[model samples]
Target chain A: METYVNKLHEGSTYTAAVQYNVLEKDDDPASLTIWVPMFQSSMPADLLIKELANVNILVKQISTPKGPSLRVMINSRSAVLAQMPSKFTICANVSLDERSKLAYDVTTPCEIKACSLTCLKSKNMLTTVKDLTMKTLNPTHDIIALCEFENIVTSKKVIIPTYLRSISVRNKDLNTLENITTTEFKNAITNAKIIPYSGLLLVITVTDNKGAFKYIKPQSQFIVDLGAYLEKESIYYVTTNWKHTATRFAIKPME
Target chain B: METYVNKLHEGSTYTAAVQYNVLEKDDDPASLTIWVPMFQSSMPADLLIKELANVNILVKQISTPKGPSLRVMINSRSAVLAQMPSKFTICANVSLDERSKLAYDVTTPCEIKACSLTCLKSKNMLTTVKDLTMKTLNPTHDIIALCEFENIVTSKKVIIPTYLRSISVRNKDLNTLENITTTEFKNAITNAKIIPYSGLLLVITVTDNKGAFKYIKPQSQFIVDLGAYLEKESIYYVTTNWKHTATRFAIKPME
Candidate 1:
């Protein structure tokens, strides 16, 4: 019988254990719990093992007070190692020759390039990180980055501190406030004021003045007050920088 | 003319505004610059408006230092408000009477349910609190929970602390004590010394007990001594709380 164990998370390392026995024509097998906790914060342990094991192994999950645990059945006298979220895998070397098959029992004989951290981090950039960890068996490689979240949902608020690291902005028009934080930016947006300017793009940024934009500003002020020119029905406001780092043009008066 | 603004994140609210004028019937409307910053953190504001607007609208994204900004065009005399993620539909109280149609400059009238926080939070839970914020648009409604991330791999280390909130173990078998915290059952696991009830499951919690489990334990200790039962090829040490709340079944020989 061989039992495999794995830690669920990085910081608060929780554990998951799997036990199994190889069955022969003349041998009787025993029942197993094959426990693997599937907590809210943990990656699926059962599915992770199967992916690394790379064998037609069958498994199921049972309920535990903490969460869901797995009951894996190993019909073969083999075992493998896995690094969850990464494809660093392992396998057993078995042969008809008793000595050779027993050799695997001494140690694992499988090696392959594991998943890289760079790729994982960029899964959201242009590549949309995808791939589900261990879940139920009939699982999908449904690997998707957080950006493409049209499928799953949860209660925890989503916040990407990495992207926001060393990131700050300032709106000169807003009382020349420097180092405007994201939360402050959000507040500014929630409460906004509008003004009209002619002959100029009517914008100023930290880097450039005179509103650095491609569009040509009207040569002079309006023929009449903007309100007087037309009893217009719709009015939308859009603003952005020349380089396009911050774009906040949402549709006006959401329907 | 119309403009829209959106919040960057829940904290830092940023605004994107667009402005344009209604054109006369025969007049060739002047091409105007409708700008809105579309930062890397924001969803495709232009595309989002199009999805909700259902109008023949034209928009282009300009490059900015903070991120991409939007330049949208408007030809209608109708205005509406929107919170991109939600869809509280809209309507045209249009009047063939130009005067009546122009009346829309006063306000918009459309009410319904929009996106809520419940769904938004779920987006990251199954996806392991994915991609921080918006990056791409080929969205999946990836209705996954954070725990199902057996597939998607990211560089961020995984952490789950609540379940194993207060747990630890001791290895009575190992004399050498290095750096170990009991909230960690790892110490006991690494320095395990099995006996006929010789080792104890040292834990204090309501949910589980010393190696807590549902499986049946034998009435007596030895059935031909577990070691002599056969020339077992691989032996795995399984340990956990009898109560079942704390289970740390490691798979290795970590002396």
Candidate 2:
């Protein structure tokens, strides 16, 4: 037995035939076959094609485009070409000393200028060649691939929710003032400036006395009446020589 | 009144004297004064210095370092050098015809190479000059500048909070299945394969009978008993020739 190999360029056509060994007395020439090994480029190397007959073969490029094409076939008659496996094989029966011719033609070649297989082996190999058109497969893009975790039960536990604690207001000065029931205002003892306030003079002054206190200017007649009452009641109260004009005389106490 | 300008360099000492106007007969020599105008470089051009005398004068650089120095003075005795205004004026009481000498020495001058002002005006000017050291002001860095928004009542209204609406689940298929109370299984009409399942064979098949239907293979003796019962009851039923081995004959109904 002998083997022969030839480079097949794209857009070129070649005819192929199988040359078989002389038939023996018991050998059946019609049963002898020639097999072309083919596979999907992505498949493992160990699972190469073994035998192929009476099956539809497919030779198409892998990935999107512009690369080496894959050859594969399937036996299921109902399988759709788009949904079937990506690899297959082809075979032809031969007669003793008779040429079983096949054509091999290519149009769109691989990325580089290349050739196709013409005479793979000498045994049962016929050498007559004809142009055979390579069938291109345009895969559909509508299929959705699934992630690994989508169909399986997961061991991840459910997360427990946490609530935020309520924050309390903790100003010491504001808390102390809120707790006090009675309000206090002291008398003005230090010298203070009189500022303009709503068409009248306003003075902000603090007094040494703890509780609220009030004094009217002596120019008011109501102050005189209050003084008369204080004098009659034997209340020893002091009055200042108020220089500014005053409105009414009244005694104000802490609330 | 003549005006002169000069660029002062840093780290140089120079003496400066002011040539003033001659004192008239009516001018009081003790009250007659010569004014040296000084201001902050950052101050407006029109608001220049007018007069300064008997005031604490400060001659220091405006920025942190490495720039032209600003000369200023304050009249308030209690004013701090660091907290006072950045610009001020300086004045000197001058006499008639006598050389009232003054020294204007600068240890650290302006950024450029130069000299200080020596003779400014022409009349009652003092010519003799002595070396004087420039007083440096080490400003404190503790003061905080306020932004425009601080201490002012804003007219902007408070914003109202918004709430998110709750979302409802709306799967049409899941909803229809959830509403159904009774469950039904159909009989398997097509050819089905029996698969190995947990030490037993399991087959998934569908029947055209809507409610449910079941049949047992005739290989078991239980089927003959069932046939006898069916024959006595006169129930019209049909049975098929079972090919595979069956464990037990039973009437199975779809759940």
Candidate 3:
């Protein structure tokens, strides 16, 4: 498969979304599958037939009219850090096999700081990285760089309701004031800016005071009001403070 | 949260898909979040709120029209087996608060096999499951069971064209005779019956007898042909006769 990178129309460009996911097979170590489907536009017209192979990174280039996708499947035996959904730019230089069929020598590992993290919902903890830690992260427009975990399980991305204000973290044992701290508020207000949008995607975590607690179960009732609609850093940052961890946080509109 | 589950309308069935997920707080054990949403039909009636909290189980039932959902959040410290998505029937026998406010007593853990699984695409594994494990296990006629990791990926569920015949499994390592064992053939032909339908959902798994390999990755090319189908007792059976495992099975017309 080595001498097969010489059959392209030279400088042809292909672009597609890159998705990374974890796969488990019975008791086997988790593996990663990188699915890359080159857009049809980049597929040349005379490419109905193909014969090419690149052994270096285990690449396959097909000549199908629609499904000329490249799937790079790697096992846990030899894994890479690029197994998470992040930003990457790749280059595919087309080629041909010994039979002079079309092929490709796709250059990959073209890594970048693909700003995507989620502890949202995973079945297993030890196998998956739940929460990510970062500093002055690369912030994007209209998104909250939630240092905490956040999840929105919907068939589609639902827009936040217009009247929603601050997302409050409620506690059964303490009053509203004790649930969050003065320093945490000072830091959030000082560090962030308000979102121009209707509301923010709040990440609510839970912990008991003194950090000596077991499971943080969801409460029976959940309506702790944080009167105003204020957003900084494209989100309204309100945490359980360092005093107690929040089991779950709920969002409320201006009621 | 103890005196919570005193609100519900008795015997009124509310059915919505249930999803189980995990959430984590910094330096804390993982907590479980059970998200449930009422179907479209359950939104109109005025509802009461409450729970049926067992020491090991945590439950919440809201009274809102749209928010009429139960979120059973469990912390790992004292977690129960409800972590897996399976069976659980709930009964809501509700009453009113002293002021005639809504209230309910939800009796739950009313368990039964909920037979649901996800096709969460994973990052690793050369040959195993992918995005095809979802949907009602009993797909209508002309579809496949695909247990043990089978896939038919398409932008849409492309129906088999009438011109198409049997679905075949092709592998370079095995010849026609070795491709399928004679015993497998005799057994399948003997124990199974075919559907009068036009198409079939075929299951194809492979092995490398020489190397004794367990899984088969998606090949550069894929085309497997099976000429028959059958059904009985809600389960259409076909045999590969290799052993307790059946590589290829086909279902038909019943859809």
Candidate 4:
């Protein structure tokens, strides 16, 4: 048996563990309590239910806690009977053969073994095997394959499938101001300004006095005579949506 | 009698002057040569033709020069006969008074005085006037009025109409870098970066070590055990589409 933990977001992590426990003689209609650590900021309960479904787990109701804690549940008698597996080890590996067939090999075997493989580009394959080499009976175009194996009840398998990458950048530091100039730093600043309480300042220098002067001048003025000296050498600034507030502005070369 | 110069664009300026001259005895079917300066980077001939049309000038063709020179043409015989005013001065001003009237006053007297007022919120008013108190007698709910006056040909009038502000900030100095911070400056930087040769860099500082560390780590690593010292105190950085180029970066507080 193998286990894998996938961190999907800042608050949601999925742990898939293939495990089984032996039931005592006195443990009639036995029950199992699985404690899954849930995060408050994680995905909604419905989505979590779907994620758990991929591993053959059925969650009927989710009662979240005030804090980050565990979601505990006792398996129903019928559910336990339908889910509990006999002590067994069943494993499968999938690959694409030279003939372009999605092929699989059952390396470990136990009673009532079953192997299932899903081809993302095609359909699926289901069979019973023991140290047997099998391939999709009808070959077709296929990409990644998801493989699963179970013997009576317990199984361990690994395969590849199309998936999404959820990357979340959280708790970014907002207190410190760094002057280290870099492209990354500039982009970070630009993005940060998108948040409330943050803003960006643009610094533009005067290149053509005539052009810049005209831009800053009032539109109603039909004629302007900025004496020879001032017309050629005066510094001009243009503003839009600005208040007379002192704010630190960064200087970057105009594009 | 009256002249107005409208600065439409940085390089394209429109000057409309109305003047008249006595025809010499031998100057039968006298021709008038008008010199209109043309900007090389101005709008195309088709659009200029439409603008000149408002002033009753028909431009069949436009021949641009290499330098900022005149586009000279002699008035066509038929056009000159149809447009030349009989030595007259015509003036009009528009206003809206209590009676909900789009009123206009012909302050200057001229032969064949034609006053035309266009109501933006309604239709138009066309009439002949001489010191006459006129209003849109059949007026509907009207807003601003565009008034114009002409006599036998040449006319001088002004009015109001819907228009666009074509503000162009050209020749912005890109050589000098300024650090004066302001919301305007920040926005300018953001806008400039949209230019082809311009770009924006974002800087983000670390806030939560656990959060930031997890973000920078590779997805393939299912488990990470950052030493006690590093887990709590180590610094981490995350990058997306960045090269190792040593470009200058600006630091701004994270959002």
Candidate 2: CAPRI quality band:
incorrect
DockQ values of all predictions: 0.02, 0.00, 0.03, 0.00
Show where candidate 1 strays beyond 4 Å: A1-53, A64-118, A121-255, B1-255
lDDT of 4 by residue, A1-255 (tens): 112222221223222122211111222311111222211223333343333333322211111111011121223224212332322211100010011111111111111111111111000111111101132233221111111112222232211111101111112321232222234333422321100000111111112213111222221111111111111110111011112122122321111
Ranked by TM-score from best down, the candidates are: 3, 1, 4, 2
Off by over 4 Å in 2: A1-255, B9-38, B42-255
Candidate 4 error regions (>4 Å): A1-49, A52-119, A122-255, B1-8, B13-255
Mind sharing the TM-score for model 2? 0.11
What's model 1's interface RMSD, roughly to a tenth of an angstrom? 27.7
Better of 2 and 4 by TM-score: 4
Each candidate's interface RMSD: 27.7, 54.8, 21.4, 38.9
What shift in Å separates residue A234 of candidate 4 from its native position after superposition?
56
Least accurate 10 contiguous residues by lDDT in model 4 chain A = A193-202
Scoring model 3 with DockQ, what do you get? Answer: 0.03
Cα error, residue B79 of model 4, in Å, equals 20
What does the lDDT read for residue B235 in candidate 2?
A: 12
How many clashes does each candidate structure show, in the order listed? 111, 30, 47, 22
Cα lDDT tens digits, model 3, B1-255, are 212111112223322222222222224322222323222223212222111122233443332211122334332221222332222322111110011111122322211111111111121312222223221244232323221222223222211111111222334534543433445333432332211111122222222311111123332111121211110101111121111222333333221
